[PDB]
Design a protein around this ligand. Sequence first.
Ligand SMILES: CC(C)(C)c1cc(NC(=O)Nc2nc(CCOCc3ccccc3)cs2)n(-c2ccc(CC(=O)O)cc2)n1
Ligand SMILES: CCCCCCCCO[C@@H]1O[C@H](CO)[C@@H](O)[C@H](O)[C@H]1O
Length: 334
Amino acid sequence: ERPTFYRQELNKTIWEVPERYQNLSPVGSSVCAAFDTKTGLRVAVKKLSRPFQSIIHAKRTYRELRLLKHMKHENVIGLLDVFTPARSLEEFNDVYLVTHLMGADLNNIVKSQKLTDDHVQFLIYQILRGLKYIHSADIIHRDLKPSNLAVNEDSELKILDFGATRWYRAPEIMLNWMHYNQTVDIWSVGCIMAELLTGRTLFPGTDHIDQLKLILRLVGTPGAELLKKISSESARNYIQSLTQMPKMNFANVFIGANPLAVDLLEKMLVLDSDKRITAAQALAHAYFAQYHDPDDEPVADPYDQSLESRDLLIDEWKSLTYDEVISFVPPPLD
Ligand SMILES: CC(C)(C)c1cc(NC(=O)Nc2nc(CCOCc3ccccc3)cs2)n(-c2ccc(CC(=O)O)cc2)n1
Ligand SMILES: CCCCCCCCO[C@@H]1O[C@H](CO)[C@@H](O)[C@H](O)[C@H]1O
């Protein structure tokens, strides 16, 4: 049965939310923090900004809703509800999405500070547990950084995507290589992990060249095996035109760090992506012996990327989105 809605104005915009959600307060752009009374959880409610104004906005609205409907895992963000005040497609013009309100991001939790080895273990273990799921769905995050990592007081973590940044991106992404695989996320984790242990940004670049200048200093200049894989002539010509760097010994970079954490970093921060560890592989690594459980690191039913990359008319995205809203099954209660 259709819930009774209530109208309230917040943040230069009218909001029509069901009775369920209470004490709506703006947290930034539009999203409000709120209390859900059916479940008892504090929730974040995002109103989709101008959803069907352009083809892009509409295509973008559908992608999010679908993807998040399919995302059902504890270390990946999910949907507690999705709703519209529309009683009919022809009056359909706004979309709201709901999830557990989350305390802080990985900067806010504790970033500037040097976390303990046991604590780092738990966090990285979780990211990896989430990445296994997202990857099995054939999805690549492409933008893993701490500001995309939601974490409560208990330090339970969920991966998310907010639709300095350049510090965590795989080298190939900076060089605008336009074929890449899932291990660009493994690089990001590598960086995130290095930081958690040291309290220090691994690669605190000032611009794009500086960024790659820094990355090479740690991992070394590309070997003749990697050299053979660069497609672009000009690019190859430039890599030759560099002074040879030796791979820095990680032991000396991460002084006194648990050498299990070092070996793991060795395996993530590998310039050639084909040889980086996979999320699945990393969960098996001794470093997470105190957390790893192969019977509870589940995968996703595979996901249709091709459905979100289409030349559709406005009304066609609007109707496919509406259908998704109608077809929404909430997750079973606690
Ligand atoms: C699953 C994974 C990480 C791949 C993922 C997760 C998300 N989505 C996501 O992170 N959403 C978030 N939004 C905020 C700010 C708003 O308040 C939170 C909030 C309140 C209520 C409900 C949800 C969120 C923080 S986290 N995308 C994603 C997919 C498509 C697009 C569209 C495009 O393609 O541009 C953009 C992102 N991919
Ligand atoms: C400064 C020069 C550093 C080059 C960094 C990019 C090398 C990353 O590795 C490359 O990743 C590509 C994209 O996934 C793959 O197609 C290649 O197989 C792999 O060699």
